[PDB]
Amino acid sequence: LRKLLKPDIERERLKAVNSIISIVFGTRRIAWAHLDRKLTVLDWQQSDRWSLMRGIYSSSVYLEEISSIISKMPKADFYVLEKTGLSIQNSSLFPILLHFHIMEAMLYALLNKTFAQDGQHQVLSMNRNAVGKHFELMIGDSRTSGKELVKQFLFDPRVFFPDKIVHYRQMFLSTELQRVEELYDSLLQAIAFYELAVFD
Amino acid sequence: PENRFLRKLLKPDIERERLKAVNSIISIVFGTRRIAWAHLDRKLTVLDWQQSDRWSLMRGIYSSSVYLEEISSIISKMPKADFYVLEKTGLSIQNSSLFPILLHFHIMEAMLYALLNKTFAQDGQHQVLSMNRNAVGKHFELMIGDSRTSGKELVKQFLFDSILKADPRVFFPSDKIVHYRQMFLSTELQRVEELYDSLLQAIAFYELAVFD
Amino acid sequence: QLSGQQQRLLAFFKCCLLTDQLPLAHHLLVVHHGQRQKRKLLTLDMYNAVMLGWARQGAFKELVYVLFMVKDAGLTPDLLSYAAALQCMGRQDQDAGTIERCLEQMSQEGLKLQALFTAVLLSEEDRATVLKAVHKVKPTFSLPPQLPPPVNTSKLLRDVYAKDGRVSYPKLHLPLKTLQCLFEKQLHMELASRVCVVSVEKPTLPSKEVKHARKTLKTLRDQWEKALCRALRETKNRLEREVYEGRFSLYPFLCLLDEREVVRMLLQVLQALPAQGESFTTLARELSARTFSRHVVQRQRVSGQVQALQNHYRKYLCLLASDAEVPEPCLPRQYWEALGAPEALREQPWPLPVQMELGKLLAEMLVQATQMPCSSRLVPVLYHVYSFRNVQQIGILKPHPAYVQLLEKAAEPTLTFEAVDVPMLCPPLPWTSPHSGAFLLSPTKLMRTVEGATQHQELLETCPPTALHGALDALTQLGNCAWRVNGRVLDLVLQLFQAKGCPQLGVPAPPSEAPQPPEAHLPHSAAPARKAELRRELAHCQKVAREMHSLRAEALYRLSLAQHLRDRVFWLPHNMDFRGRTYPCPPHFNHLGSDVARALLEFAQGRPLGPHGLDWLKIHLVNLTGLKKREPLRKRLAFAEEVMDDILDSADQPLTGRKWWMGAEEPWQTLACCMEVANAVRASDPAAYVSHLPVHQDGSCNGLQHYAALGRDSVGAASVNLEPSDVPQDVYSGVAAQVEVFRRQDAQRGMRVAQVLEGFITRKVVKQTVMTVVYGVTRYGGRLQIEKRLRELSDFPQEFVWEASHYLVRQVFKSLQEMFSGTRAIQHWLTESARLISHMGSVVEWVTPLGVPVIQPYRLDSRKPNTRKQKNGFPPNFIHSLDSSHMMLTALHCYRKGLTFVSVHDCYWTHAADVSVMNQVCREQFVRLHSEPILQDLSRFLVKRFCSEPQKILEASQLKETLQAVPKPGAFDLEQVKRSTYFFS
DNA sequence: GGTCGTCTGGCGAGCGCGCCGTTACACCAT
RNA sequence: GCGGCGCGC
DNA sequence: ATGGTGTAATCGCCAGACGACC
Ligand SMILES: Nc1ncnc2c1ncn2[C@@H]1O[C@H](COP(=O)(O)CP(=O)(O)OP(=O)(O)O)[C@@H](O)[C@H]1O
């Protein structure tokens, strides 16, 4: 899967996976989702307190924020980060694009807790437009929102939300007018990863 | 006012009690093609001083897996120390043409803050700090105009002056001095700036913050 | 097979030969011969070099020692070794028995004495010494006689080199002694490479502060010179002590030049260094290139080539001189070769590591050897700064800001040029080889190439000798034209330049006149829009100020060179590009430039106007005005007659009158023409007036003209004026009319796109696209050309112009397909052939019909061809070879009639009396170039060249299917171009 | 590793000449 | 040799 | 005048590689 997954990975190790963390980051918020092999969502969360993108880049503050965010996350066998697809030629995208790489870089260094010994990659990145073409959210060259798709999924469904599903429904009804897309994109990215990579 | 000078010199806020009671540091200076580091004791002795020059980085794409592999390979050779000093460049986001370098400088540092700062999850205290290069150049009088100049002559004075003189800044051990002089003499046609900036930053940290 | 250190040692030994340091090279040779691990690097070339040096010196015992060392090594002696031995025997006379035994031993090895005498790089003196030795041994041996030079027997070039035809070759207007002293001036100017020219910027009054700054500069420069001398002396001493031990060093390379010359070159490089510095490697490369060039120039005065060149140039000047007559008139190159020929030699460059090491050593010497006071202990001037340049980190030599401050204060009024970027003060040497040529002492190249491109000059050196004689002679003839400065135009240009210049005419403005950002009263933090617009205004003002400063710098350089060349006669040598198009060697001041450069230049020789000179001057003036471009010549002349008052007023009062000449497209050339016409009309006899002004005849579009000629298209030729007509036919007006016809048909669909565009069809919209069809423009680029022109005009939509642009591109392309069909057939065939050749893995190569080989250099990063560039460049490059062939034929046939002919591509310039004759030569050679089958000869050459490989037989057949399908010719005869009045006009 | 149907990023008018400059801007300070 | 401009065909 | 300084936010076609088969 060279075109779908950016790091090279063996398919045999891809097939034998238990649960995956899917992480989506934006300028102001982080969201992630813990989803297992049986397509049942174990966790789905986003954080509001960010304290970054205030005009001063500082690696210590980034380290503190990513450490605090990672401390909440449960353990899994693979961490799927998004790929934004922006180009280095566009100057106006410079203040944002840098942020993504920084947030990507630490997320490779902080989450590969055993890379020093074994030398195996536990964190992967998958292309966004492939997910959009799979879910048919691509109108023209730009992906559309996924609020309708996640409302249809949660309300033989692809995702099997559990006892805890009432809390997820309360979160979904909680200020849905707010510009939150990372929470939807993490879940749909996890579903797309489980469909394209380990299935069929 | 002294704390203001240390805040201008050092990016992460570190209390004076831990800065005064250090024992050993590693100074690291990296560039597009090369990285260099130097390890110094409280009594200033260069236990090792090393260079890495062959990289797959800064060739086209910006893939973070290759960055992680290369940084892990470099860090594996590095010994342990109390503090890890890193160089801070004057590049800003305003200069768009220099953005491909700046991106690079923001990736490696992001890994060097992550991989080197072990036990940060438990302790919660910083162990990697960034030091401005202009302040070091002003301390060593290497600043002409707004451009910092090379310090090859100062390092040559440090290394090849075998006379005792009066109060030397740095001590080179007798066992490793021959290899140090060989490395200095080998890279004379091609100047390796990081190999000099690492030692200069180590001395500047041991004088401006420690032994203040 | 050659290692880097082996190249270092070979260059060391060659430099020791050049600097006459044989004992030192002998010491290094024996110390490397002592150790067994070092002898693997040693090569027979090194032994032959040391043998040749000892032979030139005259030491037989050391020569025998080197033979003993070669025998101990076990190598086989070479023929050049025996030639050096014979040279040593000749120089130091000995008994004939030993030399006879040496010849017998050489004969036992199977070597041939003829192979010793010829095909060896040894100089004429060495050959003479070897011949003396052989004559001492065997007087029966003699060299074969020298054959007479071959004559080119090409069909197109037969009339140029025919002895039976009557010839009247032109002659210069200057006597012999004047040409001799001009030769002396040029030799003394080229011996010292730098040339100092007084600036044309208005000077500043010298205050006391500027005089103090100049005195401090002089004292500092004296101390710097002495310090550089001491540093160079101690460096030479330590490097010699290094060579005494068994190690390689650069001591002979530092001994290559005199100490004073090296110090002067270093001081010049220090002076030329900008405020913000340049990369260390660039300075090293410039230092190495400059010291190599100075060695090449200064070696000849020691070796005595300067005196031989002086004598042979003095003998050769009789052909060009007015008061001297040769026994039989001939071409300048044939006269140069008929006399004694000074043997110019191709020079072998040093290896790149040696060049870089020498440059870095000299730059380090400059850095360490120069100190200044801060104004107080001494501090260095130059420092190493690691800074970001382009997208990469690099080291930079940066000077002290005090040095920059002292350079800015008390500004020097002088500028520095090289001896190769200034026009020649003497008539140029004839072009006799791809390497020998125009400049007296500086090395020359026939074809301009990028760095590292040696295929162009290697394919040019394997052709038959006669093939380039058509081109070289033309390149000589274009070099023999004598130029001068107009003078009256230069005064007005300098008057406008030194004051606030007029940018409408083409004179840049001073930085004081540059705009400034508006004053700000509102706080920046009050509104983001206010600070944003202030920042944008500042960033625009800085950019336009930088552009104005660059333009003023270019104008200052050009006008300073023109002022230097005032009241003196100069010659512009010419070379070629890789396709055969000719360009002048001096880049700044030449006739291939803007209005000012073309108006400053006049002919040194003058010719009487004659019966029809004034009419041609008037037609040239009307052509330069541009008011009558679609009118016949008679109406142009009538317009010239009815506007004579404006011409006289402009000539008498250029800047304090009605200023009519400013309304023309080319105002400076228009003013020159008005002055020239004013003097002629006011003369006693208009016919007897002597005119120096060049008259220009141009063609509409050589791309479509040559494509029509190749395809013999009946309807294309009418458009491109290849068929006789009373009124000139413009391609742009015709294509615009066809496009407007297509828009009327759109009424069927009634599209909004059509009806908004109905009024605004114009020649201006389609002119750029029709002139760029020749260069293989795509529909996207045609859109990017039409959309701009739509943007300036106030079209009805003013938005969704994207929809309007695509339809216009499609209709202009359909109209140009119906107007030009054979043209696009030939372009498609050429593109397909280029694609199929590039896919097989080779670059496209073709021979110009005058015999010049052309190879297309585009390649990827033993590299692979760039298929896209090779595919998209062949149809434009092929036409330019045809244009240069016709231009060279016109030059070579105008020279036989005593005509002063110069060419700025597509434009032929000559005296006003000699225009009509040139027009015949312009047309009669167009019919003779295209009478011969160009396309079928090209097809046969391409088949023979690119389909002779036994491998890939299927691909070979696929290539031959396309290559042997030339487009079918049409039905327009090519012999009626001779009656076309507007072919070239 | 060799090959075929495809698809997906990329370049979109040829030669040849030049100049100038390589974080920017208001403040500070003088 | 990489950016901003200008010129000629 | 000079000189140092403390700050950041809408085309549309072509040539070389990708996956399955060998
Ligand atoms: N053969 C050519 N190829 C490419 N560009 C050319 C060209 N001839 C001229 N140009 C460029 O096109 C510009 C405008 O051409 P013009 O100055 O209008 C002379 P023209 O092309 O013959 O139009 P005309 O027939 O109305 O005189 C020139 O200034 C020059 O930069």
Coordinates of N, CA, C and O in Angstrom, one line a residue, chain C residues 13 86 90 188 255 515 934 979:
Chain C
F13 N 54.0 18.3 -13.0 CA 55.2 18.2 -13.9 C 55.0 19.1 -15.1 O 56.0 19.8 -15.5
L86 N 66.3 13.2 -29.6 CA 66.9 13.8 -30.8 C 67.0 15.3 -30.7 O 67.9 15.9 -31.2
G90 N 70.4 17.4 -31.0 CA 70.5 18.6 -31.9 C 71.0 19.8 -31.1 O 71.9 20.5 -31.6
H188 N 48.9 46.5 -26.3 CA 49.2 47.0 -25.0 C 47.9 47.0 -24.1 O 48.0 46.9 -22.9
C255 N 54.6 30.0 -8.8 CA 55.7 30.5 -9.5 C 55.3 30.8 -11.0 O 56.2 31.2 -11.8
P515 N 9.9 56.8 -6.6 CA 8.8 57.1 -5.7 C 9.1 56.7 -4.3 O 10.0 55.8 -4.0
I934 N 15.8 20.6 -49.4 CA 16.2 20.6 -48.0 C 15.6 19.4 -47.2 O 16.3 18.7 -46.5
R979 N 10.9 38.7 -58.1 CA 10.1 39.9 -58.5 C 9.3 40.4 -57.4 O 8.5 41.3 -57.6

